[PDB]
Design a protein around this ligand. Structure first.
Ligand code: 2P0
Length: 330
C-alpha cells in the first residue's frame, strides 16, 4: 500500500439472537427497547477491507466484487461520517466487502457487515477502540452488529444513550463449544421486507407490544442463568418461548403481519418431534420464514437426518458456535 494510505481488513461473524432485539427506543442512534442475547456462528461471516487515501473524494463500497447503487452508496457515506467524526479526520475510504453468508437463502448479513466495517476502520485508523467502543460504533450501523464484535454468547445492554447502549461477551465456561445451530431454509416470497421497518411498526402500534416488554427481562435472566449452569433444556425452553412471543407482537401490529409461513410451522413440528424422541433441540425465527434450530453438537447429525426426511439436502445448513470475536485479517 501507498505511503499516505491507511488500510485495515477484518472478519466478523453473524449472530442469531436467542432473546430477541425487537423495537427501538431511539431510532437515530439505534437504542433498543430491551436487552438481547445471541450466539455467534462459526460458518457465516463477512470480510471487509477498508482503505483510506487522502486523494479519495468520496467513499466507495464494492460488495462481492460489484459496485453498489447510489442509495447504498449514500447510506455507507453517512455511516463513514460517523467514523470520520470519531477519528477526527476527513479521509474517505474505499470499502471492499465480501459476504460469506447465505443471503440469497434469507440469512441476514447486517450484523457481520457492520461489525466487520467497524473493526476494519479501527485497524486502518489506529483508533485503539475498546471492544465496548467497537460495539457502540457497530451499533450505529445495525443494532444486531453490536453483538458480532464478540464470539460465543453475547448480550446487548440496552442502555439509555449512545454511550451506554452496547454489547459484551458472556463467558460460559466454554459451553459454546458444545452447541450448534441448524438453519432450515424455508421457501419464502422474494419480495422486499425489512426488520427495521417491521420492528418499527410493531414497536409503535402493536396491541401486544406491552406483553412483550413485560416478559423480556424475566426471559433474559432465565436464559443467562441457564447459561451459567450449562442447562440446555432450560435455555432452550425459554428462548423458544421468547422467539414466539416476538412474532406474537407482529400479529398485534396495526395492521397485522407475520414473517412465518406454513413451512416454518412444519419445521417447528419436526423440532417438537425430535424432542419427544429424546433428541433435545429448540427453534427460533427472525425477520423471515427460516427456522433456526439450536441443538447440542452431539445431536446435530441425528436432528439433521430428521429434517432431511422432508426438506431438500440443500436447505439444511448447520453451523457451530465460534468461541472468538471479531478478528483482523489480511
Ligand atoms: O437480530 C435481532 O436481534 C433481531 C431479532 C429478530 C431478528 N432481528 C433483526 O433482524 C434485527 O436486524 P437489524 O439489522 O439489527 O435491525 P436494525 O437495528 O434496524 O439495523
Amino acid at each position: 500500500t501507498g505511503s499516505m494510505v491507511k488500510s485495515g481488513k477484518a472478519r466478523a461473524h453473524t449472530n442469531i439472537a436467542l432473546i430477541k432485539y425487537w423495537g427501538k427506543a431511539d431510532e437515530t442512534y439505534i437504542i433498543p427497547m430491551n436487552n438481547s442475547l445471541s450466539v455467534t456462528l462459526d460458518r457465516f461471516y463477512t470480510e471487509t477491507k477498508v482503505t483510506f487515501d487522502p486523494d479519495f473524494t468520496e467513499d466507495c463500497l464494492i460488495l462481492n466484487g460489484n459496485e453498489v447503487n447510489a442509495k447504498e452508496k449514500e447510506k455507507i457515506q453517512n455511516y463513514m461520517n460517523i467514523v470520520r467524526d470519531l477519528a477526527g479526520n476527513r479521509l474517505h475510504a474505499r470499502i471492499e466487502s465480501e459476504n460469506y453468508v447465505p443471503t440469497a437463502a434469507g440469512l441476514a448479513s447486517s450484523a457481520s457487515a457492520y461489525a466487520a466495517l467497524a473493526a476494519a476502520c479501527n485497524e486502518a485508523l489506529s483508533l485503539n477502540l475498546s471492544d465496548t467502543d467497537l460495539s457502540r460504533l457497530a451499533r450505529r450501523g445495525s443494532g444486531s452488529a453490536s453483538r458480532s464484535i464478540f464470539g460465543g454468547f453475547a448480550e446487548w445492554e440496552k442502555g439509555h444513550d449512545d454511550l451506554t447502549s452496547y454489547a459484551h461477551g458472556i463467558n460460559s465456561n466454554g459451553w459454546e463449544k458444545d452447541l450448534s445451530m441448524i438453519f432450515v431454509v424455508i421457501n419464502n416470497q422474494s419480495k422486499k421486507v425489512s426488520a427495521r421497518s417491521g420492528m418499527s411498526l410493531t414497536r409503535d402500534t402493536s396491541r401486544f407490544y406491552q406483553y412483550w416488554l413485560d416478559h423480556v427481562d424475566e426471559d433474559l435472566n432465565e436464559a443467562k442463568e441457564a447459561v451459567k449452569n450449562q442447562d440446555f433444556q432450560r435455555l432452550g425452553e425459554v428462548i423458544e418461548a421468547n422467539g414466539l412471543r416476538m412474532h406474537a407482537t407482529n400479529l398485534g401490529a396495526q395492521p397485522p403481519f407475520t414473517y412465518l409461513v406454513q413451512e416454518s410451522y412444519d419445521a417447528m413440528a419436526i423440532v417438537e418431534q425430535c424432542r419427544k424422541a429424546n433428541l433435545p433441540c429448540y427453534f427460533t425465527m427472525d425477520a423471515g420464514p427460516n427456522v433456526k434450530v439450536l441443538v447440542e453438537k452431539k445431536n446435530k447429525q441425528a436432528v439433521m437426518e430428521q429434517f432431511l426426511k422432508v426438506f431438500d439436502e440443500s436447505k439444511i445448513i448447520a453451523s457451530d458456535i465460534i468461541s472468538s470475536g471479531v478478528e483482523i485479517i489480511k
